[PDB]
């Protein structure tokens, strides 16, 4: 059953690599969007200060 071996590894290797990468890639996108939220907070504070 070469297929069980192909599947046992394909399931794990293709997914752990692609999936964990999406977790951290998006974590950075999300952190940047969170920075945008901070920058909007900053923008709101600056408009009020002016």
């Amino acid at each position: 059953l070469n297929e069980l071996q192909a599947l046992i590894e394909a399931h794990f290797e293709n997914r752990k690599k692609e999936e964990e990468e999406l977790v951290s890639l998006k974590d950075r996108i999300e952190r940047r969007r969170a920075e945008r939220a901070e920058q909007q907070r900053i923008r709101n504070e600056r408009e009020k200060e002016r």
Partner: peptide, 29 residues
Amino acid sequence: MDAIKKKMQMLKLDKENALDRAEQAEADK
């Protein structure tokens, strides 16, 4: 868990064949 639906069948065949033999071996007298 299709990997083991398939492993199950393989082991099922291995035991069924060993079992077929256990039964025959006893049946043969």
